Design a protein around this nucleic acid. Structure first.
Ligand SMILES: Nc1ncnc2c1ncn2[C@@H]1O[C@H](COP(=O)(O)OP(=O)(O)NP(=O)(O)O)[C@@H](O)[C@H]1O
Ligand SMILES: [Mn+2]
Ligand SMILES: [Zn+2]
Length: 346
RNA sequence: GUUAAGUCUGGUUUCCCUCCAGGGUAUCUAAGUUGA
């Protein structure tokens, strides 16, 4: 964790320009002793086994073959018991004096109620406060966020107006800027923390991670690219149907397979057809072309396997989900019938 | 044995509808949340 955060500090210092990287530098130096703590605690449990348990002093044993199914179950038992207490990674930090006594670095705006809460985190206090979208430059510059007019556009590119950030979620934004710093962790033990920063600052590559606006507007984009110029001549002006300037690629397969198809997929729908100053013009444009105006909804599809824990424990609740409860194993003498049937079949 | 003269009456009374069928079958509805 600390190798990643320090490699991030060095990669950001390699870019004292671009505003956002400069703000990241400026607030990292103020929050180290808070950013020392990892944002994600781990639980580690071990289980021991010796030759007293496996061998009759020269060979294997009988009930030695079952020694794994016993130690694995001991391990999972202690995991289950320790999961009875959840401690959150925020409880580890020392903030009493930093909040009671104003000590927090408030680079950005200043709260009129002590400190702000992170909009991305919810619980941690905010370090980088962004003014609301009414007049930014005339504030972003007299405050400490930006230095010029050119650097606001790059700060405003990652931190929307109004986004308060805690050190952890701000570091998350920083990593999201270019997610190639992950090789500090992805490899580890293999290259220096500086080999990688040099490699990244050498071959500059920008990535476009899709927002919920991009997902909601998928079929709209798709229906604009089957009218490549037949819709472009109408606009021809607002960079929606203009050249791919750089060679930006991304992990979104649909974005990656549909980029060189006339329409610039890296526009923000919150700017064009989800905006409040535009989108009437865009309603007209889509009306004039048989374009189904986009819905603001997307699908968050989650899925988890059923009883894979018990399955690794060789239980039968995976096999009979609902019939055999997990609690039915405490005294399995009751449901002898279904287990007998299916186990014998198998 | 003879004379005369016809006169009275001018269809009534019942029954005027009874019984059964008083709707049956088929369709019972089909076809068709979007933007801030
Ligand atoms: N024996 C195991 N080895 C490795 N990972 C495990 C093991 N048991 C659980 N996990 C993972 O650690 C987490 C434990 O969550 P948990 O939900 O209890 O697992 P589970 O077996 O899937 N129970 P459930 O998902 O409710 O059916 C999940 O991310 C599991 O994928
Ligand atoms: Mn699971
Ligand atoms: Zn945060």
């Amino acid at each position: 964790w600390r190798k990643l955060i320090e490699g991030l500090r060095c990669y950001s210092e390699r870019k004292r320009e671009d505003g956002f990287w400069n703000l990241v530098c400026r607030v990292l130096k103020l929050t180290e002793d808070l950013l020392q703590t990892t944002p994600l605690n781990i639980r580690v449990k071990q289980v021991s086994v010796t030759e007293d348990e496996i061998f009759n002093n020269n060979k294997l044993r009988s009930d030695s073959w079952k020694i794994y199914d016993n130690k694995y179950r001991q391990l999972v038992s202690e995991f289950k018991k320790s999961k009875l207490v959840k401690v959150t990674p925020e409880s580890r930090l020392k903030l009493f004096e930093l909040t009671k006594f104003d000590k927090l670095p408030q680079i950005g705006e200043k709260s009129k109620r002590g400190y702000e809460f992170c909009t991305s985190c919810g619980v941690l206090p905010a370090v980088v406060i962004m003014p609301k979208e009414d007049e930014l430059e005339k504030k972003l510059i007299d405050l400490g966020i930006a230095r010029d007019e050119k650097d606001v556009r790059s700060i405003k590119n990652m931190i929307s107006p109004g986004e308060r950030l805690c050190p952890w979620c701000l570091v998350k934004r920083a990593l999201g800027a270019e997610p190639r710093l992950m090789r500090i962790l992805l490899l580890g033990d293999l290259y220096s923390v500086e080999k990688i920063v040099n490699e990244i600052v050498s071959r500059d590559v920008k990535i476009e991670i899709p927002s919920t606006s991009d997902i909601a507007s998928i079929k709209t984009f798709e229906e604009m690219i089957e009218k490549k110029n037949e819709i472009c001549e109408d606009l021809k002006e607002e960079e929606v149907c203009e050249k791919p300037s750089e060679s930006v690629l991304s992990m979104w397969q649909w974005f990656n397979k549909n980029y060189y198809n006339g329409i610039n997929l890296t526009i923000d729908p919150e700017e064009y057809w989800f905006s409040e100053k535009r989108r009437r013009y865009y309603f007209s444009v889509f009306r004039r072309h048989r374009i189904t105006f986009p819905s603001p909804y997307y699908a968050l599809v989650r899925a988890d396997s059923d009883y894979l824990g018990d399955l690794l424990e060789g239980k039968l609740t995976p096999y009979l989900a609902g019939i055999i409860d997990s609690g039915d194993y405490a005294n399995i003498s009751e449901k002898k019938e279904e287990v007998n049937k299916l186990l014998e079949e198998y």
